[PDB]
Amino acid sequence: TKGTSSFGKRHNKTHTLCRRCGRSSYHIQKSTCAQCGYPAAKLRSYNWSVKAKRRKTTGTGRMQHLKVVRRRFRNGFREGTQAKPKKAVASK
Amino acid sequence: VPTRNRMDAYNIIKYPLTTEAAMKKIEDNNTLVFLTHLRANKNHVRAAVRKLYDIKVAKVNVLIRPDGQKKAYVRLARDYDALDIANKIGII
Amino acid sequence: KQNPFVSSSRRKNRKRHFQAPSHIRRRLMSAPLSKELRQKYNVRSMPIRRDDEVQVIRGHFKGNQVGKVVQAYRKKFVVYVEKIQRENANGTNVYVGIHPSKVLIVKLKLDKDRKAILERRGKGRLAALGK
Amino acid sequence: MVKVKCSELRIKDKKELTKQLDELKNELLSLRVAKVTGGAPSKLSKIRVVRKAIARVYIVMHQKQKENLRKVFKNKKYKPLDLRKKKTRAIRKALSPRDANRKTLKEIRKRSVFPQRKFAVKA
Amino acid sequence: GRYSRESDNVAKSCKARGPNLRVHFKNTHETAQAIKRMPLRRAQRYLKAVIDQKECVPFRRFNGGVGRCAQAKQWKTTQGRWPKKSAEFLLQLLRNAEANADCKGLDADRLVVHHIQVNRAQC
Amino acid sequence: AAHKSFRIKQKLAKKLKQNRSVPQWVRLRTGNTIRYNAKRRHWRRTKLKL
RNA sequence: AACUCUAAGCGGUGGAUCACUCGGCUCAUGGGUCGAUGAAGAACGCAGCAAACUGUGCGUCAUCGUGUGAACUGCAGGACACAUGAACAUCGACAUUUUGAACGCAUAUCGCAGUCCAUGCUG
RNA sequence: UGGUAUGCGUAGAAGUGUUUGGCGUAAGCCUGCAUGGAGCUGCCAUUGGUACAGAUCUUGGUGGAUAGUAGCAAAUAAUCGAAUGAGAGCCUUGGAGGACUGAAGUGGAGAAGGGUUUCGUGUGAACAGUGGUUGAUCACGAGUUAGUCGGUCCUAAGUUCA
């Protein structure tokens, strides 16, 4: 009778929330992500899956550290301080 | 560094709940109910309450809200009456 | 634009003025100095500073309503001036949006900052006349 | 209240700075107490001013730690990782200027007698 | 506004509309038709009669599969229905127009409906 | 489920916050495209599902 | 009559057509600037009012320093600290969560240890 | 698109409705009138993503079927009737009254699952293929407290991998 009835016995979550990507695609039984190769060094970023890379790429996230690296390059990675050529006394 | 201790007595207690049901528990059961950090292990809550507000804490029972926050129900020693202390914190 | 850094391109220029960070927005939101003030300081224009008296050279008012700028609302690209308001159906007097490129600045606030900028404007005034 | 300047902090001893952190934190809490009722200035801004005041005081005391560490580790080789010029990974390992200019004894002879001299051709 | 035929030097007239009102597109068309060019005072009495099942509204355009009612033989057509919800909304808008008529100081007795036009609103 | 793992409870809890109808004073902003909150997840209309 | 047919006027319905566009596309030009000094990406919590976008990390819609020099703005708490500074940029000093190469071991568990330093309580 | 008519133009462009008048065998053109609001065209050369009725074409919209024809019919199924409201057979509800499932339950709990759905308050449009003041709706708030129950821990089938 396994027609809609085949849908009716579907209660057992095969995939749970990815530790790497939250895309809910990690196989309990194989302990491995479809897509994002779950704790086996490589993320499985396929060049056949052009769209997959597009999701996984830089720019989908805030790119926090690396954005600051770009501006510092133009500064020629200087540690110091520019400060102030003229007065400028803070008194009340 | 060294990196300063990231759970001060302050941070542990974010707010008092002040909700309608929570206020009743001050009156009747002598409990002061606080919104707490999800990092606060109960024993954090006791320490912080004791230190900030001078109160001897008897027991602490801790709930997680479906709003991703903690509620800590802090039972006070019978020497300290709740309702005075709530209004020392300034909140009716 | 003869130099290679250089957008004549319509789409790019529209990025610049519409999406303008507030400091570029001041430049855009400059108003020319009154014929009086042009004799005194030899300055074309200054970027609107709150207590500046203003006369609106266009729409509906076309000469006068000698009033002081409440705030330069740079994100709306609009300047609101005290005494210049449009009657709403709900009796509520709401300020008329006045672009500073419609305006004469009649009175300039003097700060050490403001004077220095008038002075920059004074010094360059000599140069291209020379040229 | 008048939002703390960094300049005002920097005169003060570290003991006074830590002391002001306690006092601002008690004030932050008293203002959080107000926040419940929709606190005395109808929507509560003052809570933002004081939270950011605590941030600024923390920073000035941290910068004084940071320079304290820098002056101790000054004259001392192998300074802690966060004092080391976080430039980029590649640049750090990319051969110090001394150790790029290094020329074989023979190359010094070759160059010493025959350095390319600024001459000319022709009519 | 634009009542779409504007009757008599617009000083003699008071008007009504109602879009989007959630009543059956062509029930309203057919009830409208039974009111058109009829004295208003009689017209309300006819609409009251419809709901009281004394009289059937004649189902002229949108004929099928409307069975049959004896009570439409007054209007010479075999097929009548009592479509109560439609008749109620036309009633409300008649009373609005009469209320508007009193404001203009139009003579109550001499109100005749000279136009009803029902058009289809967005589904 | 019925007693939800803590990771699940945090994700669902954030989702409950999303299900709120936009403050109506934000709708009045200059170049405000926001008419409504439109990502309102009503649990028997849009699950979270899978 | 009604309806139907045919045409026209007017009203609907519907979004074609036009004109616009802070976007797209393609070619050219300059530069080389991720990561165990803990990345890119993910999750999580954050605005006076936000639920997202965007921004950020527990100092959470952002902080130093620096530049400019008075906004933000929907409503407002604020606005004050416009002369030492708003706010935006610069962003070279710091912070930079839980993670993820991901590093004590695990992960339908935010689960469970070991170690050093340290705090309160009891002694 | 190059050139040009020192072209037209917010004093109304283009667009478009049009028993305006006319031209050409036609492809098609102009003009009037109404609407309109911000830009546009003729001519000579120059290039094409260049003209549609169709492709069981595509995509969006709309008819006749049909303001109603299928139907909205299994589990009898209500009903008196008080309260309220804009409206009330149900849904709001008491009292009342016909019955239903007939403790192997349409009950009383939980797992697997759900994810705020629970609950109070407000209660309108949309939704409940019917109404609907009421709801698992919509809006606004609150609520899930453990040393002893589970997770945890442990191993199994089995797995992650130095």
Side-chain angles (χ1 to χ4, degrees):
Chain A
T1 53
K2 294 65 169 179
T4 28
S5 167
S6 63
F7 296 77
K9 305 176 164 178
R10 308 189 185 181
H11 307 295
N12 302 314
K13 304 176 178 176
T14 273
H15 297 316
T16 43
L17 308 158
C18 306
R19 284 262 57 205
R20 275 181 170 171
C21 296
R23 285 174 186 170
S24 71
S25 59
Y26 99 85
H27 195 344
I28 304 186
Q29 286 187 316
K30 289 189 192 168
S31 69
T32 43
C33 284
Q35 211 162 7
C36 304
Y38 193 87
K42 272 75 270 310
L43 309 84
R44 305 179 183 150
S45 48
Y46 304 110
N47 320 283
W48 54 254
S49 206
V50 198
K51 39 255 160 54
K53 283 184 166 195
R54 205 165 296 132
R55 298 165 194 147
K56 288 168 82 290
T57 43
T58 186
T60 56
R62 314 168 180 130
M63 208 205 323
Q64 312 77 250
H65 304 91
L66 220 174
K67 285 183 313 178
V68 193
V69 188
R70 207 67 61 180
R71 70 183 76 248
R72 289 182 65 204
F73 178 67
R74 319 183 73 158
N75 298 337
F77 298 110
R78 300 189 173 187
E79 190 265 307
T81 305
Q82 260 96 116
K84 17 68 181 176
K86 32 57 68 68
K87 162 172 172 173
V89 184
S91 291
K92 310 297 301 296
Chain B
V1 47
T3 55
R4 300 185 184 151
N5 288 7
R6 304 170 191 158
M7 281 312 306
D8 302 306
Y10 295 102
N11 297 308
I12 294 164
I13 304 181
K14 298 191 171 169
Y15 289 95
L17 303 190
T18 60
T19 51
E20 311 176 13
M23 285 311 295
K24 304 177 187 179
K25 308 177 193 176
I26 316 189
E27 302 175 62
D28 291 299
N29 297 309
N30 297 11
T31 61
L32 292 175
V33 206
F34 295 99
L35 283 184
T36 58
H37 215 301
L38 309 177
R39 294 172 177 172
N41 305 347
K42 290 180 174 178
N43 295 90
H44 285 59
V45 195
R46 300 165 190 251
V49 172
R50 281 168 185 159
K51 288 172 180 174
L52 288 161
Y53 309 111
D54 309 289
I55 354 180
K56 291 180 182 182
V57 167
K59 242 188 182 178
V60 177
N61 295 312
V62 154
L63 198 245
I64 295 185
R65 280 183 164 222
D67 301 291
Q69 296 177 307
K70 278 180 178 178
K71 294 184 166 177
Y73 296 82
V74 183
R75 305 183 205 185
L76 295 179
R78 295 179 183 188
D79 299 288
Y80 288 110
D81 296 301
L83 277 167
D84 302 304
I85 302 189
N87 297 352
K88 293 175 184 173
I89 299 164
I91 317 189
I92 298 171
Chain C
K1 285 190 153 189
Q2 293 180 37
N3 291 284
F5 303 114
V6 109
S7 56
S8 64
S9 50
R10 222 179 177 193
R11 314 188 177 73
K12 293 191 187 176
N13 280 291
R14 289 172 175 143
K15 305 170 183 177
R16 292 185 178 178
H17 296 345
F18 289 141
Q19 301 180 257
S22 57
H23 294 272
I24 296 188
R25 293 176 158 159
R26 260 192 194 71
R27 311 164 193 176
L28 306 170
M29 297 291 281
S30 296
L33 302 196
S34 65
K35 315 186 184 198
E36 306 179 8
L37 289 193
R38 287 180 168 194
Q39 300 173 16
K40 301 172 187 173
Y41 289 129
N42 302 292
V43 167
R44 294 193 164 193
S45 50
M46 282 294 290
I48 292 197
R49 310 186 176 226
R50 300 195 183 178
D51 294 349
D52 287 359
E53 290 197 1
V54 149
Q55 288 182 14
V56 204
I57 322 169
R58 289 194 303 180
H60 312 301
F61 319 116
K62 219 172 184 173
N64 295 298
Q65 272 190 300
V66 197
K68 287 184 157 188
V69 174
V70 179
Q71 287 183 352
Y73 276 58
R74 307 193 166 124
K75 191 257 281 194
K76 297 192 180 174
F77 301 98
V78 144
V79 179
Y80 294 143
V81 183
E82 294 196 313
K83 276 151 187 179
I84 303 190
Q85 300 185 284
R86 269 165 186 167
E87 289 177 355
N88 303 4
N90 289 243
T92 52
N93 299 252
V94 176
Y95 298 106
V96 183
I98 292 141
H99 294 241
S101 66
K102 309 170 182 172
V103 150
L104 293 171
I105 309 186
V106 184
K107 295 191 177 164
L108 282 165
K109 303 166 102 177
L110 299 175
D111 264 0
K112 307 166 183 178
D113 299 1
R114 299 179 183 132
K115 277 180 174 175
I117 295 166
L118 291 166
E119 284 168 86
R120 297 168 172 171
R121 288 189 177 263
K123 290 165 185 171
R125 260 250 178 197
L126 312 170
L129 288 174
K131 297 167 197 173
Chain D
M1 193 171 197
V2 194
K3 186 63 177 78
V4 181
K5 316 171 192 61
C6 273
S7 197
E8 288 178 289
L9 296 164
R10 280 179 292 227
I11 182 150
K12 302 197 310 171
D13 310 291
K14 291 187 177 61
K15 306 185 184 78
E16 308 185 351
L17 292 169
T18 196
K19 184 176 183 190
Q20 193 170 273
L21 286 166
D22 203 65
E23 292 172 327
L24 287 174
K25 289 178 192 281
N26 285 304
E27 184 185 1
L28 170 279
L29 186 56
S30 185
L31 268 54
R32 285 187 115 90
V33 152
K35 192 59 176 295
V36 167
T37 190
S42 62
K43 304 286 304 180
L44 189 53
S45 192
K46 298 175 176 183
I47 185 172
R48 202 193 186 165
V49 180
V50 63
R51 80 182 73 154
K52 293 202 298 184
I54 297 159
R56 201 164 175 174
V57 180
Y58 188 104
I59 293 159
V60 176
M61 200 161 70
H62 190 95
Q63 281 183 129
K64 285 177 175 172
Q65 294 179 129
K66 187 57 58 172
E67 64 194 299
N68 197 263
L69 292 160
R70 277 182 177 274
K71 62 185 73 185
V72 170
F73 296 127
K74 194 171 195 168
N75 316 313
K76 305 301 177 180
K77 60 182 62 279
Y78 301 103
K79 311 194 284 290
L81 306 165
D82 300 299
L83 306 173
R84 295 187 175 190
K85 295 178 171 174
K86 317 189 170 182
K87 308 184 182 182
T88 43
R89 183 192 211 222
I91 301 179
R92 302 159 192 169
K93 303 167 190 181
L95 290 163
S96 56
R98 315 198 183 203
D99 299 349
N101 294 349
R102 296 305 175 104
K103 290 144 182 183
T104 63
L105 298 175
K106 156 216 70 188
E107 282 175 58
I108 305 173
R109 314 190 186 161
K110 288 187 180 188
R111 290 166 200 280
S112 66
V113 185
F114 306 99
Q116 296 186 303
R117 325 183 204 80
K118 317 180 188 190
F119 320 119
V121 272
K122 49 182 170 179
Chain E
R2 295 181 180 286
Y3 309 92
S4 64
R5 204 147 301 98
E6 315 192 356
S7 58
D8 297 306
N9 308 308
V10 215
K12 311 183 180 182
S13 44
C14 273
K15 307 186 181 192
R17 295 177 142 207
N20 290 244
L21 295 169
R22 305 90 206 279
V23 278
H24 275 31
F25 283 140
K26 322 99 175 187
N27 274 325
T28 46
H29 298 337
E30 297 166 297
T31 55
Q33 287 181 94
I35 300 157
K36 292 174 193 179
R37 314 176 186 192
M38 308 308 301
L40 204 184
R41 293 185 169 223
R42 300 192 187 163
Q44 292 188 280
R45 296 178 190 185
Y46 299 160
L47 294 158
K48 292 155 185 166
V50 166
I51 299 176
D52 295 347
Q53 297 205 342
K54 312 183 178 177
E55 302 183 55
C56 279
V57 178
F59 276 48
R60 295 171 183 202
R61 281 270 167 150
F62 298 107
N63 298 276
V66 185
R68 278 72 143 272
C69 293
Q71 327 183 346
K73 291 196 172 192
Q74 300 184 4
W75 313 85
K76 302 189 164 188
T77 56
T78 59
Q79 307 178 269
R81 252 183 189 195
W82 311 275
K84 303 185 170 175
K85 276 196 178 173
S86 59
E88 295 175 72
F89 273 93
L90 299 191
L91 268 169
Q92 288 165 235
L93 301 181
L94 279 172
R95 294 160 187 165
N96 289 4
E98 280 181 300
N100 300 317
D102 296 313
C103 305
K104 290 200 181 168
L106 304 177
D107 297 302
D109 302 299
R110 294 189 176 211
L111 308 164
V112 181
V113 183
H114 269 193
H115 294 268
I116 303 186
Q117 301 174 246
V118 174
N119 300 328
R120 298 186 175 171
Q122 312 188 60
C123 301
Chain F
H3 287 249
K4 312 93 197 161
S5 49
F6 182 29
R7 293 186 189 89
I8 300 186
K9 185 174 180 183
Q10 288 177 259
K11 304 201 178 187
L12 300 177
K14 207 167 181 172
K15 301 181 171 178
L16 301 196
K17 311 175 182 196
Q18 292 184 52
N19 310 341
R20 294 176 181 158
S21 64
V22 157
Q24 307 185 252
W25 287 93
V26 170
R27 304 181 177 174
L28 304 172
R29 302 168 184 171
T30 59
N32 199 251
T33 51
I34 314 190
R35 286 181 177 187
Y36 291 120
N37 186 237
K39 292 191 181 199
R40 298 176 186 145
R41 308 171 196 215
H42 292 305
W43 55 282
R44 53 161 45 199
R45 305 192 170 169
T46 50
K47 321 205 91 280
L48 321 169
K49 317 186 313 315
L50 318 173

